[PDB]
Design a protein around this ligand. Structure first.
Ligand SMILES: CC1(C)CCC(CN2CCN(c3ccc(C(=O)NS(=O)(=O)c4ccc(NCC5CCOCC5)c([N+](=O)[O-])c4)c(Oc4cnc5[nH]ccc5c4)c3)CC2)=C(c2ccc(Cl)cc2)C1
Ligand SMILES: [Cl-]
Length: 139
């Protein structure tokens, strides 16, 4: 499995489902993630809605805001649900970057998500069965 491909295909899906074609953006993990993320957004739509309105996103503060939320999301540890929420939050910032006329941020956000998966979540994901376990548990 490829963390970068999973991030890239999700963002392209999230932005396309908001009417935007993201330029820079096995098959079962993408399908399972997109369904799990949609399920999470449905169940926590108010949190999704209020997260966009409270971001105060500028190119100067974008990374500090991304890192602060991701830090808090995994402060108490990692599970598959928080990983799904991690993807959904990354989608918020990408849609919000496009809405606020800051589409270049999508490529930076894609990189920050890939880095976090490669360097901080990778060991937990591998030790808890990898994405194979994720698709088995929820796909
Ligand atoms: C500053 C902040 C950090 C503060 C906090 C918040 C918001 N928080 C984030 C964490 N959150 C969590 C965390 C864990 C869990 C969980 O139970 N975990 S679990 O037991 O491992 C698991 C259980 C079920 C599925 N799947 C169901 C399947 C059913 C059949 O269809 C396919 C899917 C999965 N799974 O991996 O799919 C995994 C969870 O509950 C659910 C419930 N239903 C879910 N459906 C999909 C995921 C999911 C999680 C919700 C609560 C909300 C902030 C915030 C704000 C906006 C955005 Cl945008 C983001 C974050 C900001
Ligand atoms: Cl990386």
């Amino acid at each position: 499995y490829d963390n970068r491909e999973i991030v890239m295909k999700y963002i392209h899906y999230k932005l396309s489902q908001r009417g935007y074609e993201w330029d820079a953006g096995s098959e079962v993990v993408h399908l399972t993630l997109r369904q799990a993320v949609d399920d999470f957004s449905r169940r926590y739509r108010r949190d999704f809605a209020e997260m966009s309105s409270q971001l105060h996103l500028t190119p100067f503060t974008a990374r500090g805001r991304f890192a602060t939320v991701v830090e808090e999301l995994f402060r108490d540890g990692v599970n598959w649900g928080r990983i799904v929420a991690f993807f959904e939050f990354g989608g918020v910032m990408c849609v919000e970057s496009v809405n606020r006329e800051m589409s270049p941020l999508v490529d930076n956000i894609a990189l920050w998500m890939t880095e976090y998966l490669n360097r901080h979540l990778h060991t937990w994901i591998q030790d808890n069965g990898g994405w194979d376990a994720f698709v088995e548990l929820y796909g």
